[PDB]
């Protein structure tokens, strides 16, 4: 179990700007807001189960 996992995805600077620390899934059905889990060798989508390379 992970608590406040959503908080970890985003970083807020002192001026209130919001920056995304994780990449979003390119599948249109996933659309925006669907974040790829960062594994050592791949990026994994929890919704589509698609796999992307980390440096692609």
């Amino acid at each position: 179990k992970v608590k406040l996992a959503v908080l970890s995805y985003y970083k807020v600077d002192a001026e209130g700007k919001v920056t995304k620390l994780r990449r979003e899934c390119s599948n249109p059905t996933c659309g925006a807001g669907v974040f790829l889990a960062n594994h050592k060798d791949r990026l994994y989508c929890g919704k589509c189960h698609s796999v992307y390379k980390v440096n692609a």
Partner: protein
């Protein structure tokens, strides 16, 4: 017959290998499809298409929330007829008396017999008080006639359904309650015999209801008292004995 059997066994084996062969080819293509998965999925993603509720669907969603706003009714079961209730009650009475007769004649519920036991015997907000003293502190400032009120509330405040572990707490409270019933009898009550009579029997009635559900905890405490009282008798003899000891034996007969 034997020839017919050998044909049947041969056919069954013949079909079994065919099914196994069918399963064998089944995994082969699935492996091939998995290998070709990445090539296939890519073209699908290249050709993915670009981006009103039915009135019935609108109504159903509207119903869901309005039902949420509504209060919820409690359910009820069928009322058994008076003849059925009497028949069921009579059946339960008949079963219980029969078990009592069997236990009287030596039936022991581990369904063993007394003779079995005779082998080798001769050869060799509201706080739930886990201890008797705790209950006194909670009821320290209350009058004698208020003890049933506080004792009943503790049971209500810690019913099994309210939270996990309440069965254990109530189980111990059954043991604690018994010591309280014996404890009060020791204390002088000639001043307010009427008040003591209203509290002592009331607490016993509460203990009976608890004993129906938590006889095991009560049974352990009851045996402990017998050993403790025996130990006191070894030293003080009759001085150890008190009014509560007479009361205690009386309660055991009830429960």
């Amino acid at each position: 017959k034997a020839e017919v059997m050998k044909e049947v066994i041969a056919k069954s084996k013949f079909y079994k290998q065919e099914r196994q062969k069918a399963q064998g080819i089944m995994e082969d293509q699935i492996d091939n499809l998995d290998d070709n998965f990445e090539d296939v999925m890519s073209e699908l993603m290249m050709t993915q298409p670009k981006k009103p509720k039915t009135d019935l669907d609108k109504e159903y969603d509207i119903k869901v929330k309005e039902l949420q706003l509504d209060k919820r009714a409690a359910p009820s079961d069928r009322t058994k007829t008076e003849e059925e209730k009497n028949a069921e009650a009579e059946e339960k009475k008949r079963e219980l008396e029969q078990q009592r007769l069997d236990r009287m004649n030596g039936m022991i519920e581990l369904e063993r017999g007394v003779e079995d036991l005779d082998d080798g015997f001769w050869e060799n907000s509201i706080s739930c008080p886990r201890t008797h003293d705790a209950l006194l502190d909670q009821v320290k400032k209350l009058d004698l006639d208020d003890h049933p009120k506080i004792v009943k509330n503790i049971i209500k405040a810690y019913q099994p359904k309210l939270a996990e572990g309440n069965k254990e707490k109530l189980g111990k409270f059954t043991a604690v309650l018994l010591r309280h019933i014996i404890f009060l009898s020791n204390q002088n009550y000639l001043k307010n015999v009427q008040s003591f009579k209203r509290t002592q029997n009331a607490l016993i009635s509460i203990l009976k209801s608890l004993s129906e559900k938590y006889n095991r905890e009560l049974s352990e405490e009851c045996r402990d008292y017998i050993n403790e009282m025996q130990a006191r008798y070894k030293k003080n003899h009759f001085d150890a004995l008190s009014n509560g000891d007479l009361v205690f034996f009386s309660i055991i007969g009830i429960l």
